[PDB]
Amino acid sequence: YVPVPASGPSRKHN
Amino acid sequence: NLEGDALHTLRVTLVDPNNVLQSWDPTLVNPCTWFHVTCNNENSVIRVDLGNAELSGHLVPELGVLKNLQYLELYSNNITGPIPSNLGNLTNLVSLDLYLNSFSGPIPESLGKLSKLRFLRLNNNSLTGSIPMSLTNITTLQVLDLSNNRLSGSVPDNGSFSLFTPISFANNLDLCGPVTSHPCP
Amino acid sequence: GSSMDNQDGFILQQVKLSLDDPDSYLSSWNSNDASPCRWSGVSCAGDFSSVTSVDLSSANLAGPFPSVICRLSNLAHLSLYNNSINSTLPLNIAACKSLQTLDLSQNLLTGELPQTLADIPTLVHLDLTGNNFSGDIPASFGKFENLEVLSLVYNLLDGTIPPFLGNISTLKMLNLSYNPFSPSRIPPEFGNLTNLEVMWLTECHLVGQIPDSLGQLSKLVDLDLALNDLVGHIPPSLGGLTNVVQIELYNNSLTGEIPPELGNLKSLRLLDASMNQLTGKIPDELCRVPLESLNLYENNLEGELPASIALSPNLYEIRIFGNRLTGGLPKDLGLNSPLRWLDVSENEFSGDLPADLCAKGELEELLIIHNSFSGVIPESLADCRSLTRIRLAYNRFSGSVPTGFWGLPHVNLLELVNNSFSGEISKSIGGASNLSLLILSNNEFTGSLPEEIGSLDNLNQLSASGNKFSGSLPDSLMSLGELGTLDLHGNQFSGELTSGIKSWKKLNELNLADNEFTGKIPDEIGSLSVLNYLDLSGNMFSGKIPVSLQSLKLNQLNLSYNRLSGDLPPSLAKDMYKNSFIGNPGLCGDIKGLC
Ligand SMILES: *[C@@H]1O[C@H](CO[C@@H]2O[C@@H](C)[C@@H](O)[C@@H](O)[C@@H]2O)[C@@H](O[C@@H]2O[C@H](CO)[C@@H](O[C@@H]3O[C@H](CO)[C@@H](O)[C@H](O[C@@H]4O[C@H](CO)[C@@H](O)[C@H](O)[C@@H]4O)[C@@H]3O)[C@H](O)[C@H]2NC(C)=O)[C@H](O[C@@H]2O[C@@H](C)[C@@H](O)[C@@H](O)[C@@H]2O)[C@H]1NC(C)=O
Ligand SMILES: *[C@@H]1O[C@H](CO)[C@@H](OC2O[C@H](CO)[C@@H](O[C@@H]3O[C@H](CO[C@@H]4O[C@H](CO)[C@@H](O)[C@H](O)[C@@H]4O)[C@@H](O)[C@H](O[C@H]4O[C@H](CO)[C@@H](O)[C@H](O)[C@@H]4O)[C@@H]3O)[C@H](O)[C@H]2NC(C)=O)[C@H](O)[C@H]1NC(C)=O
Ligand SMILES: *[C@@H]1O[C@H](CO)[C@@H](O[C@@H]2O[C@H](CO)[C@@H](O[C@@H]3O[C@H](CO[C@H]4O[C@H](CO)[C@@H](O)[C@H](O)[C@@H]4O)[C@@H](O)[C@H](O[C@H]4O[C@H](CO)[C@@H](O)[C@H](O)[C@@H]4O)[C@@H]3O)[C@H](O)[C@H]2NC(C)=O)[C@H](O)[C@H]1NC(C)=O
Ligand SMILES: *[C@@H]1O[C@H](CO)[C@@H](O[C@@H]2O[C@H](CO)[C@@H](O[C@H]3O[C@H](CO[C@H]4O[C@H](CO)[C@@H](O)[C@H](O)[C@@H]4O)[C@@H](O)[C@H](O[C@@H]4O[C@H](CO)[C@@H](O)[C@H](O)[C@@H]4O)[C@@H]3O)[C@H](O)[C@H]2NC(C)=O)[C@H](O)[C@H]1NC(C)=O
Ligand SMILES: *[C@@H]1O[C@H](CO)[C@@H](O[C@@H]2O[C@H](CO)[C@@H](O[C@@H]3O[C@H](CO)[C@@H](O)[C@H](O[C@H]4O[C@H](CO)[C@@H](O)[C@H](O)[C@@H]4O)[C@@H]3O)[C@H](O)[C@H]2NC(C)=O)[C@H](O)[C@H]1NC(C)=O
Ligand SMILES: *[C@@H]1O[C@H](CO)[C@@H](O[C@@H]2O[C@H](CO)[C@@H](O[C@H]3O[C@H](CO)[C@@H](O)[C@H](O[C@@H]4O[C@H](CO)[C@@H](O)[C@H](O)[C@@H]4O)[C@@H]3O)[C@H](O)[C@H]2NC(C)=O)[C@H](O)[C@H]1NC(C)=O
Ligand SMILES: *[C@@H]1O[C@H](CO)[C@@H](O[C@@H]2O[C@H](CO)[C@@H](O[C@H]3O[C@H](CO)[C@@H](O)[C@H](O)[C@@H]3O)[C@H](O)[C@H]2NC(C)=O)[C@H](O)[C@H]1NC(C)=O
Ligand SMILES: *[C@@H]1O[C@H](CO[C@@H]2O[C@@H](C)[C@@H](O)[C@@H](O)[C@@H]2O)[C@@H](O[C@H]2O[C@H](CO)[C@@H](O)[C@H](O)[C@H]2NC(C)=O)[C@H](O)[C@H]1NC(C)=O
Ligand SMILES: *[C@@H]1O[C@H](CO)[C@@H](OC2O[C@H](CO)[C@@H](O)[C@H](O)[C@H]2NC(C)=O)[C@H](O)[C@H]1NC(C)=O
Ligand SMILES: *[C@@H]1O[C@H](CO)[C@@H](O[C@@H]2O[C@H](CO)[C@@H](O)[C@H](O)[C@H]2NC(C)=O)[C@H](O)[C@H]1NC(C)=O
Ligand SMILES: *[C@@H]1O[C@H](CO)[C@@H](O)[C@H](O)[C@H]1NC(C)=O
Ligand SMILES: *[C@@H]1O[C@H](CO)[C@@H](O)[C@H](O)[C@H]1NC(C)=O
Ligand SMILES: *[C@@H]1O[C@H](CO)[C@@H](O)[C@H](O)[C@H]1NC(C)=O
Numbered sequence: 001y002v003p004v005p006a007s008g009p010s011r012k013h014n
Numbered sequence: 015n016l017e018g019d020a021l022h023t024l025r026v027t028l029v030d031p032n033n034v035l036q037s038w039d040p041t042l043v044n045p046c047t048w049f050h051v052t053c054n055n056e057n058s059v060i061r062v063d064l065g066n067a068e069l070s071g072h073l074v075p076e077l078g079v080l081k082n083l084q085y086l087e088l089y090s091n092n093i094t095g096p097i098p099s100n101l102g103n104l105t106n107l108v109s110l111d112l113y114l115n116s117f118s119g120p121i122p123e124s125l126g127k128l129s130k131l132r133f134l135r136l137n138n139n140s141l142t143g144s145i146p147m148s149l150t151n152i153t154t155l156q157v158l159d160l161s162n163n164r165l166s167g168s169v170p171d172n173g174s175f176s177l178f179t180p181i182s183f184a185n186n187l188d189l190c191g192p193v194t195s196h197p198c199p
Numbered sequence: 200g201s202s203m204d205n206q207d208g209f210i211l212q213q214v215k216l217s218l219d220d221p222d223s224y225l226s227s228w229n230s231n232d233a234s235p236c237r238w239s240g241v242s243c244a245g246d247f248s249s250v251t252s253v254d255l256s257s258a259n260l261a262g263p264f265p266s267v268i269c270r271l272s273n274l275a276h277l278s279l280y281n282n283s284i285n286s287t288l289p290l291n292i293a294a295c296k297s298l299q300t301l302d303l304s305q306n307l308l309t310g311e312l313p314q315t316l317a318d319i320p321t322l323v324h325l326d327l328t329g330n331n332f333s334g335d336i337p338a339s340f341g342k343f344e345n346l347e348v349l350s351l352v353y354n355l356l357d358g359t360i361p362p363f364l365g366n367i368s369t370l371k372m373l374n375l376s377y378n379p380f381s382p383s384r385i386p387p388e389f390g391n392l393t394n395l396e397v398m399w400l401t402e403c404h405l406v407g408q409i410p411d412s413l414g415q416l417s418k419l420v421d422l423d424l425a426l427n428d429l430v431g432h433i434p435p436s437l438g439g440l441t442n443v444v445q446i447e448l449y450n451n452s453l454t455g456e457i458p459p460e461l462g463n464l465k466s467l468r469l470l471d472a473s474m475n476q477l478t479g480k481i482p483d484e485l486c487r488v489p490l491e492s493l494n495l496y497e498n499n500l501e502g503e504l505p506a507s508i509a510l511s512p513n514l515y516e517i518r519i520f521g522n523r524l525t526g527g528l529p530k531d532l533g534l535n536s537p538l539r540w541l542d543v544s545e546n547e548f549s550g551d552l553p554a555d556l557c558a559k560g561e562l563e564e565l566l567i568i569h570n571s572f573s574g575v576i577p578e579s580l581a582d583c584r585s586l587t588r589i590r591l592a593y594n595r596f597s598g599s600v601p602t603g604f605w606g607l608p609h610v611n612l613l614e615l616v617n618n619s620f621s622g623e624i625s626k627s628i629g630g631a632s633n634l635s636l637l638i639l640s641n642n643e644f645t646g647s648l649p650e651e652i653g654s655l656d657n658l659n660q661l662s663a664s665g666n667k668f669s670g671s672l673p674d675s676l677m678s679l680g681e682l683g684t685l686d687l688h689g690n691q692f693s694g695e696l697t698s699g700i701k702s703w704k705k706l707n708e709l710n711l712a713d714n715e716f717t718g719k720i721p722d723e724i725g726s727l728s729v730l731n732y733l734d735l736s737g738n739m740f741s742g743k744i745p746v747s748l749q750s751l752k753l754n755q756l757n758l759s760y761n762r763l764s765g766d767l768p769p770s771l772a773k774d775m776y777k778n779s780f781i782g783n784p785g786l787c788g789d790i791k792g793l794c
Contacts, residue, residue, distance in 0.1 A: 001281060001305055002329050004353050004377065007399050007423040009471040009494050010449045011041045014520060014544040014566040014590055037635070043520075047590075047612055049635065049659050050683065052708075063683065063707040065729045085754055087707070087731055109731075109754045132775070133754055156775040 017059050018045040020076040029070035058082040065111070066090035075100030082106050089135065090114040102127040109133040113159065117141060123148050130154055137161040144168065150175045158182045169193045207250045207271055208235040214265040224258035249273035256280035256302070269294035278302040285309070293318040304328040314339035321345065328352040341366040350374040352399070360403060362386035372397035380404045385424070387412040395419055401447070402426035414439030423447040425471070433472060435460040442466055449494065450474040459484040468513060473497055483507050492516035496542065500524060511536055515561065520544040534558050542566040544590065552576065557583035564588045571595050576604055584608055592616035606630030614638040621645065629654040640686070641665040653678045662686040664710070669693065677702050688712040688734065701726045712757070713737040725750035736760050744768065758783070
């Protein structure tokens with residue numbers, strides 16, 4: 001099972 | 015960033031029973047707040063400290079992307095597989111400490127490209143083959159331990175290797191040379 | 200009568216014989232049954248014995264698509280989701296002429312898409328996600344009569360994105376994300392998909408400009424063009440997306456300004472145009488929209504964050520780091536919204552932190568590093584127990600830390616580095632059950648390290664360099680067995696190290712340099728299994744260097760400028776250690792310039 005990232009905001013953070 | 019991406023690649027090919035790599039969040043701007051990672055003032059990795067963490071698995075060539083890494087501390091683990099040749103791309107490395115592991119295969123000749131290396135401890139592994147002559151070109155080398163391996167062939171006595179003593183090359187499968195006191199064919 | 204008889208049970212026994220079933224999902228498929236309706240995965244709508252749906256999802260079934268199943272006359276819904284179905288998808292799938300739903304997602308299907316999928320007139324839902332399909336999308340796909348959902352996500356499709364997909368009038372979702380498509384522009388024709396609610400084109404190697412046509416999609420709810428090489432401006436045409444709730448344009452090469460026309464989007468709640476080259480100011484009209492989430496980080500944006508953004512009752516996420524934004528954060532930020540994630544780092548923001556960032560009690564991440572913020576930490580944040588990550592470093596902050604702020608129970612990282620913070624570490628630090636990293640370096644902190652710091656069993660890093668901390672190390676500090684870094688350099692710490700240091704079995708770095716420590720280095724120093732960096736320089740450490748030091752494999756040693764006396768163990772009398780023992784008059788070794 002290749003998990004597929006949902007359509008949504010990017011999550012890059014400090 | 016690229017450096018964090020490279021270390022995350024190591025996390026996924028490593029086996030981590032104690033979850034020592036849990037803080038390694040690849041969504042962070044950089045790996046500098048990751049436990050076991052130290053960065054310089056320019057936020058570039060200079061240290062990976064993962065000694066005696068009960069880590070299993072293989073290293074990745076992606077480690078060679080860490081151009082400011084100075085201290086690679088992966089000693090006292092159960093890491094198997096070969097020393098990735100790409101470790102020779104770590105231009106600023108001062109310490110390569112892969113000792114007390116299950117590493118196999120040859121010491122990459124690429125390791126002679128580490129012109130700033132001072133500490134090379136590969137002892138207590140299953141390493142085979144001859145000791146690369148390129149290691150003699152590391153003028154900065156001060157500490158060498160290739161003991162308790164399955165190494166064979168001539169032990170260099172020139173360049174950086176002239177100062178080294180027998181305890182550095184002890185318990186190898188068939189080492190020959192002046193340090194060995196067994197002359198080579 | 201005879202007209203209405205079927206062999207559905209016999210067809211299904213042929214499906215069963217054609218598939219590997221290691222977990223016996225099909226054991227219920229008993230040919231002695233009068234009807235297959237009770238069989239696992241089988242539903243028959245109406246009293247009629249006709250099979251109408253087969254759901255074999257997550258059954259761990261392996262082998263090719265069983266084309267014989269098309270002989271079920273009334274089969275309207277088929278799912279083989281999350282199985283090991285393999286090989287090419289046969290052109291004879293079109294024999295399944297009654298199919299409304301086809302879900303073959305998460306399988307091992309390979310080869311080209313069969314153009315005959317377009318010859319099932321009843322087909323409403325087609326899902327081939329998580330397969331190995333390759334080559335061009337067939338021209339037949341422009342001719343789907345009733346298709347509402349086309350999902351080809353996470354395949355190996357290597358052709359250009361086809362304009363003919365804009366000819367499917369009934370389409371509600373076009374999901375083509377995560378395909379290694381040949382570089383292609385967004386076809387303007389996609390603006391003719393008048394019923395479209397979802398355009399998901401993430402990581403499709405898209406190039407060129409967002410077409411103005413896309414503004415014609417009045418029913419669109421999700422526009423997602425993220426992870427592509429799109430260039431040009433975010434079009435003002437996107438103000439025509441009357442029903443849009445989410446716009447994702449992050450990680451592109453977009454330039455120009457955020458159009459004020461995004462303010463016309465009444466239903467818009469989520470916008471992420473991060474990782475672009477956007478310039479100018481965030482428009483007040485966009486901020487007036489009650490957004491749940493706004494991400495515009497790593498852009499070239501300037502000017503002030505409009506105060507209007509603090510009016511939103513829905514805002515939980517603002518990530519605008521890596522910009523040149525100036526001025527103050529809105530005074531009422533967090534007062535009217537359940538703010539959870541705030542990241543305004545790497546900006547030129549100034550003034551006091553807003554007082555009520557955590558009024559709704561949900562703030563987890565406060566990330567404001569590399570700004571010019573001044574004043575004291577708001578006292579309200581002492582009650583913000585939801586916080587998990589605090590990064591206030593590289594600001595112009597001053598004053599005591601509020602007592603309660605040290606004791607927040609879910610904080611994992613507390614970083615107050617490079618400020619002018621003063622006062623002491625409160626005894627309240629004992630309540631910080633989740634604290635792993637404490638970084639207080641380059642402040643004006645004073646006082647003894649409280650004994651309660653020893654109660655932090657999971658603490659991994661204590662870095663408090665460049666402060667005015669004083670007193671003997673608390674005994675409890677030596678009970679911290681998870682500690683890998685202790686950096687207390689450039690302080691006024693006094694007293695002796697004890698034998699309790701042997702409990703620092705996980706400690707990699709001990710930096711006690713530039714302090715007022717006295718007494719002997721304990722013999723338990725050699726019992727630290729993972730210690731590679733030792734700096735005790737610039738202290739008043741006295742007595743003989745322990746022989747146990749020779750046990751360690753240090754990459755960094757400095758005992759310089761102390762009151763150490765005696766001989767160097769001959770293993771330390773090496774040229775490499777020439778700058779490790781300087782300024783010890785009592786100390787005599789065989790190193791040039793020593794003794
Ligand atoms: C598509 O999948 C089919 C089902 O396979 C299983 O699922 C796939 C995705 C993989 O995970 C497989 O590892 C898994 O088995 C494939 O067909 C099946 O193919 C196997 C051969 O791999 C067939 O087995 C022969 O089966 C007979 C009867 O059971 C065995 O007696 C025989 O014997 C030995 O098995 C021992 C095991 O200890 C081996 O050590 C020894 O070497 C022998 O192989 C064979 O295993 C299996 O019956 C068959 N299953 C079904 C339901 O048909 C399918 O592969 C293709 O077709 C087979 C006949 C063969 O020609 C193979 O090379 C083909 O590729 C696969 N298709 C593709 C394109 O990948
Ligand atoms: C995609 O499809 C997968 C099917 O291939 C599916 O997978 C599996 O996941 C389920 C649920 O997480 C697993 O569940 C149970 O099976 C247990 C038996 O199994 C195992 O032991 C072997 C060692 O021989 C090992 O290799 C396996 O990994 C398993 O550990 C069983 O004990 C357990 O019991 C209970 O739950 C049932 C469920 O209702 C309940 O009625 C019982 O009373 C009891 O409480 C589960 O039944 C299954 O083992 C996994 N199988 C495989 C092949 O991976 C994926 O979850 C699915 N993915 C998605 C996203 O849908
Ligand atoms: C330890 O360190 C020493 C010192 O650096 C290394 O020795 C040198 O190795 C390099 C290659 O690794 C040698 O490079 C070559 O130069 C040749 C010409 O050399 C002569 O003439 C010049 C100019 O007057 C002198 O300075 C020089 O000393 C020689 O007399 C080229 O012909 C070589 O080239 C070819 O092959 C390469 C592919 O490998 C092709 O890409 C090229 O096009 C070309 O055909 C090469 O470039 C260098 O000469 C060596 N110097 C000395 C003094 O020996 C050791 O190799 C190093 N490692 C080990 C294991 O000991
Ligand atoms: C083509 O692409 C589109 C876009 O990627 C795909 O559709 C979108 O698909 C997702 C995945 O199913 C949908 O998911 C969710 O949203 C619904 C609806 O609800 C809301 O309200 C609840 C109430 O509190 C709130 O919690 C939600 O945040 C949301 O506001 C949820 O019901 C649903 O579920 C929960 O999801 C959790 C996260 O996975 C689960 O853990 C929970 O157990 C629970 O089930 C989920 O959050 C989107 O709604 C949908 N978007 C649109 C605009 O349609 C589409 O599926 C895809 N199709 C194919 C075939 O590829
Ligand atoms: C975080 O805070 C730390 C500590 O406050 C800070 O580091 C300090 O940085 C400055 C500048 O980068 C360092 O200064 C050098 O300091 C030495 C004294 O040891 C001076 O001799 C040097 O030179 C001077 O002469 C120059 C002549 O033109 C003058 O222009 C200059 O002002 C000096 O007079 C030089 O300044 C200082 O030593 C460190 N201190 C410590 C403890 O490291 C760090 O830069 C801050 N980081 C960020 C990102 O803000
Ligand atoms: C101490 O601090 C750490 C670091 O901040 C805390 O850690 C982490 O916990 C997160 C939430 O439990 C966890 O998040 C997610 O990723 C998981 C997969 O890697 C995923 O399974 C989770 O699931 C969804 O999670 C939400 C949580 O709100 C649920 O509501 C949903 O139902 C889903 O299950 C999360 O997406 C994160 O991975 C983890 N981070 C690290 C770096 O370890 C930790 O909880 C703190 N402890 C205490 C006691 O406060
Ligand atoms: C754009 O979408 C159009 C609407 O679906 C599509 O038109 C349709 O095309 C099919 C296939 O040619 C026609 O199908 C069938 O019925 C005719 C009757 O004359 C038969 O001759 C055919 O063999 C076949 O059974 C539809 O009649 C036709 N529908 C409509 C409403 O016009 C276009 O082909 C699509 N264009 C592109 C470029 O993809
Ligand atoms: C969106 O469709 C417009 C209308 O057109 C057509 O009819 C459809 C039912 C379908 O069969 C499709 O294949 C046809 O293009 C289209 O405008 C077109 O009509 C004008 C006359 O009003 C004509 O001059 C023009 O050439 C037609 N356009 C094309 C592309 O053929 C409109 O252009 C299209 N949107 C685009 C391309 O962005
Ligand atoms: C040490 O002495 C080595 C043997 O003569 C020498 O080795 C090699 O380098 C030469 C000249 O560059 C190569 O032609 C030859 O292939 C190399 N031999 C082997 C066995 O690898 C080293 O370069 C010498 N080291 C120093 C520091 O001078
Ligand atoms: C490094 O490797 C050597 C060689 O395998 C280890 O030495 C042996 O240790 C056993 C006990 O485990 C002794 O009984 C042998 O006599 C030792 N053999 C030799 C040749 O010395 C050594 O323990 C390893 N080092 C570490 C730190 O584990
Ligand atoms: C070092 O990196 C370069 C890429 O910059 C690569 O070509 C070279 O082969 C690498 N060396 C090793 C030994 O992997
Ligand atoms: C995926 O497709 C490629 C190219 O068509 C093929 O070579 C490969 O075998 C396929 N992979 C799997 C997992 O079947
Ligand atoms: C952005 O895209 C580049 C490739 O163009 C990729 O390397 C990078 O990791 C991406 N980052 C994010 C957070 O999407």
